[PDB]
Structure 1
């Protein structure tokens, strides 16, 4: 009551929703992307605020401090555990939902842009396209991902070998801190500005907007998608890929999707069929690539083409907010520094991918620019020596069908333990996986020791600096969730 009273005083009432508001269920559900987290057994926010101005965010945070009510911020709602809009255990929180703050302003000539956190990647990419056919930004593959969470947790996609992660291409921010204060890079200082760009969402304050540098791409890029079944030699070919792909020139990224005894090699090349053909013949002849495989197109066209296989529907694929794809979903991730033995690839393709509840495995090769950044230069530590990342994705479509995929996800992660990174076993912060560990709260503050268990997996040697920065900007642990950076204070 106290908290709501404060909000009503400062923010338009049409932007405030209580559980009893008729529109609350659809406001809550509008960017939930995982059917596991939409059902009524999930813990719901007491209130939802949908700011349209930065002053509304500040008022909301000031109210939350005064009345001791915590806020989970949501931009695109893609959090794998839904931590932008649900808690694991009953507790009081409000959601500050940024979907209405979605402006993107591109300065083509300066090659910079200001992008609101509530914009989806598709909208950012489209706006860049309206400004220039030869500029791009290196962020996620899926068009509906929110800018806010994608950037805060790092953010990578088919330009990662060329330009690294989204967070290392951010040149300023506009942020509201745990005391409701408005900050930019200059006011927040090196530590806070280092942490917010890749140190995970929520922990370091609400980013309202990000200023990004825009990067050159040729007017024509080339995509191929070449599949090999095991009888076509997928095992030998992927065994070679793991050594070659991380060593390829930075203009060529070849990722793999596998969902049975068959691997599809999806490439984005910053250039033409005419130069890709000889490069492949020279560096990776085992794949058997020829000019018939080439799909030449602009960078903007490559986004729906890579993610959805569509060539013909630019605006609908990039500017969509209908939220129609809502699988029940589980996800895990690993990083690989040493080549798998051929026998492991044999097991993966022939055995693991043919079990009840078996999911899809995606393999993104590193090296080049992403690996050239030192491990501590940003909070994202998965850099020098990384051959590839693995994402293990399970989708299902009926609420009664969870047992087999959940069980497969657990089993394959156990199987893979000897072959992937260890001490710690690294994982990508934006592929959030609560089973890596969760925080313990003592005297209303997340403990450092509990945070460290999962924190070293996402952030490796960067965890302690993240926590010291957290202690400086938010010593009372106001902006938190079950897996956010704990404050390390003296």
Structure 2
């Protein structure tokens, strides 16, 4: 159907899962096929009305709900996951949530994709932004399994058409397939479905997860934590990840997130997942936990459970708490090395100061992600060890400026020696387009002289611009931080 203001569904469908952003579309179309997408597109382009696509609605920025967007194509009716006998690959429609993808692939076929934690995320935005997750160190990015994609595009004359692009070098649309391996949503056209398989039995055509995992939750009380203690914990963790994130590391089967929380929360915490298949799994876990707490002087509460693998993906310790109400602002960076002492000092001061819920999360990364050449996909960061996510959440819709400023100042200060942004090719490797932050393109917050596009895409940017020029010459698909041809 089509949803317009006044329809009972309008208040829900005008929003994604980020409540800071309220869309004003004149029409939201729950499209049912490529053919219906082509008709909504060609009609919007003729009218001069700006469009956007919503799949899972997890965009951290206002790309879909931007007040200029007059027409939304919502992919909820296209949520199938299955094996496509004709193409010999798994077909994930854009509106499928990760929880549905993982349940279907694993229960029916015993396989999985190494995408996000977070069952409510849609495939649409997630895959073509370079999705990664708990199994990425073991199995790479989800885009490392992208075999082909179906996408509705608009030509110079304004007519919409459906094309298939694939990983085969001789594919005439090969360049468009490459741009879907991390190029980001909302840039090239409307993805209808992705086809994924390893680069003819379905059970053999995607990776098999561990049957069981050890999951641990470790908590340090903040009350008895001084700066030196905090700094040793952070340095322990960063040194361990600097040593143990290569593509041939035995530690490819470990994932963890260390949460550096505001002191007012009462505790810092870390969640770890380790493949439990080996009979020494428990010893290996403890050696990782011991490394993180060595010399800290605070004993953590520690609890470890063995869980079947599909059950573990729904545990809020990995999946997050599912609460998408209230208001949040995210920033993020790639880390090639962990923070230096001065940055640790900044973190400690900003986390303990009574100047607000807020966390800096360090998410294990690298491993098999890093076996891929930096230019093979549009995910150009293939030597990092951690993704660092800065977050502040609040409730009062009248108090956005103060929370945005807190997180802006923290991030600027951490990256102050590189113009306030994580400039690639140093201790940092730029930014991740599925954690978009419009401040990276803001002269007031980015003083590095490096454009937002090089921070997200590094050297992939020129190729993406060429794909943009070829496949979206009219620039129908745009938003803050969208791939844009040279002026």
TM-score, structure 2 normalization: 0.82
In structure 1, which of residues 472, 479, 482 is the aligned counterpart of residue 480 of structure 2? 482
**C-alpha distance in 2 between matches for 1:146 and 1:363:** 23
Q: Secondary structure at the match of 2:363?
A: strand
Q: Is the 8 A contact 1:136 1:216 kept in 2?
A: yes
Q: Could you tell me which of 150, 153, 164 is aligned with 1:174?
A: 150
Q: Secondary structure at the match of 1:215?
A: coil
Residue 121 of structure 1 corresponds to which residue in structure 2?
98
Residue 430 of structure 1: aligned partner: 434
Take 2:172 and 2:37, find their aligned partners in 1: how far apart are those partners?
Answer: 18
Match of 2:34 among 28, 39, 54: 54
Q: Is 1:298 aligned to residue 308 of structure 2?
A: yes
State the Cα distance separating 1:126 from its structure 2 match.
1.4
SS in 1 for 2:119: coil
Matched, 1:332 2:331: yes
Structure 1 gap segments, 5+ residues each = 1-14, 311-316, 318-322, 440-451
CA distance in 2, matches of 1:26, 1:291: 41
Matched with 1:449 is: none
Count, aligned residues = 440
Q: Check if 1:153 corresponds to 2:145.
A: no
Cα 1:300/1:465, change in 2 over 3 Å: same
- 1:254 is paired with a residue of what secondary structure? strand
Per the alignment, do residues 197 and 129 of structure 1 end up closer, same or farther by CA in structure 2, a change over 3 Å counting? same
- Judging changes above 3 Å, is the alpha-carbon distance between structure 1 residues 220 and 467 closer, same or farther for their aligned structure 2 residues? same
Cα deviation code 1:9-53 (max 9, x no counterpart): xxxxxx123335454333323xx2122113xxxx51122111122
- In structure 2, what is the Cα distance between the partners aligned to 1:347 and 1:67? 51
Q: Larger deviation: 97-106 or 225-234?
A: 225-234
Runs of 4+ in structure 1 off by over 6 angstroms are 289-292
- CA spacing shift, 1:282–1:268, aligned 2, 3 Å: closer
Tell me the distance in 1 between the aligned counterparts of 2:278 and 2:347.
32
Query: How far, CA to CA, are the matches of 1:212 and 1:303 in structure 2?
Result: 20
**Displacement, 1:253?**
1.5
Q: Which runs of 5+ in 2 are unaligned?
A: 198-205, 245-250, 295-299, 444-449
Secondary structure class of the residue paired with 1:257? strand
Q: Hey, what's the Cα distance between the residues in 2 that align with 1:27 and 1:404?
A: 28
**Which one of the candidate residues 100, 118, 130 is aligned to 1:142?**
118
- Go from structure 1 to structure 2 and tell me whether the alpha carbon gap of 1:438 and 1:282 turns closer, same or farther (over 3 Å shift): closer
2:467 counterpart SS class: helix
Offset, 1:333? 0.7
**Does the C-alpha gap of structure 1 residues 97 and 478 become closer, same or farther in structure 2, counting only changes over 3 Å?**
same
Deviation at 1:471, TM superposition (A): 0.4
CA distance in 2, matches of 1:302, 1:259: 24
Residue 169 to residue 438, structure 1, CA distance change in 2 (3 Å) = farther
Alpha-carbon distance between aligned partners in 2 of 1:285 and 1:434, rounded to the nearest angstrom: 39
| 1:348–1:272 Cα change, 3 Å | farther
Query: How many angstroms does 1:197 deviate by?
Result: 1.9
What is the alpha-carbon root mean square deviation over aligned residues? 3.0
Contact 1:247 1:367 in 2 (8 A): no
Deviates more, 1:145-154 or 1:184-193: 184-193
1:467 Cα deviation (Å)?
0.6
Change (3 A) 1:114 1:309: closer
- Counterpart of 1:98 (choices 72, 75, 90) is 75
Q: SS at the partner of 2:315?
A: helix
